[PDB]
Ligand SMILES: O=c1ccn([C@H]2C[C@H](O)[C@@H](COP(=O)(O)NP(=O)(O)OP(=O)(O)O)O2)c(=O)[nH]1
Ligand SMILES: O=c1ccn([C@H]2C[C@H](O)[C@@H](COP(=O)(O)NP(=O)(O)OP(=O)(O)O)O2)c(=O)[nH]1
Ligand SMILES: O=c1ccn([C@H]2C[C@H](O)[C@@H](COP(=O)(O)NP(=O)(O)OP(=O)(O)O)O2)c(=O)[nH]1
């Protein structure tokens with residue numbers, strides 16, 4: 415009945431430890447139930463003239479579980495409306511990283527600068543399993 | 559023997575409900591067996607001068623299963639040949655979305671405009687599981 | 703005790719067959735334990751003036767398992783420092799592909815050209831499961 419009970423269908427759902435390096439920002443959350451991503455905030459004010467990029471602090475650190483990856487995606491609304499993107503998209507956040515998550519925002523508009531404010535939602539963070547593959551070198555795919 | 563039988567190795571393979579909002583376009587399909595993506599069509603004719611972007615209608619809506627994500631990726635051929643990309647790539651399609659899938663195409667060529675026609679394959683849609691992570695705020699990764 | 707023993711927690715970890723088409727380059731490896739990606743090398747020297755793109759040979763071919771996808775992501779360091787990106791990111795490598803992996807590098811800097819050398823780490827390759835979804839066409843999401 416209350417939300418502290420893990421419902422049967424979410425028994426196996428994983429936890430992500432997070433430190434709010436900038437406690438002034440809300441915890442990242444999912445916009446709606448079942449949303450793939452939790453939105454990351456900007457800790458900072460930044461203006462991007464057309465074509466410029468910035469490495470923007472999000473004020474969070476996370477501990478992606480071993481066997482998993484964090485993935486930093488552009489929001490579609492800002493992408494379409496003003497041409498905001500992420501140079502290294504999808505940003506790859508490794509299980510072992512304990513640093514601050516940073517977003518390499520870029521202005522892909524021709525002519526209009528983008529102003530981002532501290533407390534704006536600038537990206538989305540997903541968490542997926544990844545295959546930590548063992549390479550097997552072969553001389554031909556025949557043999558494999 | 560016939561294709562209506564789910565082969566043992568595909569017993570668990572998931573279904574994706576789709577509505578062809580624009581019934582004039584073929585259903586998205588995989589180019590070859592085991593292909594990660596089904597190709598999305600453009601419902602529309604659009605010309606992108608260098609550096610410009612457009613939000614292009616695909617004529618489909620989908621129901622990504624709960625626990626899953628739809629992911630909209632650029633095709634590599636158009637990317638290399640004419641510099642076509644997707645501003646918000648990888649496009650994030652949430653389980654709860656029942657709208658039309660739209661592709662934010664962008665011309666990354668310097669000098670040559672891209673012409674897209676209705677019925678062109680402009681992107682690829684993948685479907686993956688996602689971890690709907692429960693955030694656990696900690697003051698340090700020690701504690702976690 | 704020795705590394706030839708598959709530790710219990712990695713019993714199920716998957717193998718990826720690889721051919722070094724250019725045996726002069728090291729095998730792709732993970733920068734640290736639990737890293738999502740193995741770094742791909744450039745087989746070639748290439749200079750990208752601002753805004754230009756190139757399809758760069760990596761000197762490898764791989765056999766992504768059936769049920770899986772290879773994903774080619776930008777490195778964040780080069781993305782931020784010099785504006786290097788990948789036009790079709792995330793590059794989609796299909797299970798059935800046995801060709802050379804190629805990286806569609808692009809210079810997103812305004813003004814400074816990027817020089818890549820043979821033996822530079824230019825991208826990262828991830829491997830994930832993918833849902834080879836069966837489309838089910840419906841006239842409305844009601845019915846589904
Ligand atoms: O390439 C895309 C990406 C998203 N979408 C749709 C589906 C997705 O569930 C919805 C929201 O995507 P984002 O969360 O990336 N956009 P934004 O964060 O700007 O809007 P919202 O506040 O709706 O989450 O937009 C597309 O049609 N095409
Ligand atoms: O970054 C990439 C992406 C793809 N590829 C190769 C492997 C992949 O299986 C193949 C096809 O990729 P796309 O489906 O993204 N390209 P496209 O749709 O233009 O061609 P096709 O008609 O072959 O699917 O191209 C690369 O070598 N590097
Ligand atoms: O969008 C990003 C991407 C990465 N990162 C951090 C987390 C990740 O684990 C770390 C390394 O990312 P890359 O491997 O993509 N960068 P690079 O290969 O340049 O550096 P390294 O040599 O550290 O792997 O950088 C971010 O903070 N934001």
Ligand SMILES: [Mg+2]
Pocket residue numbers: 445489538
């Ligand atoms: Mg959103």
Ligand SMILES: [Mg+2]
Pocket residue numbers: 589633682
């Ligand atoms: Mg294709």
Ligand SMILES: [Mg+2]
Pocket residue numbers: 733777826
């Ligand atoms: Mg790296």
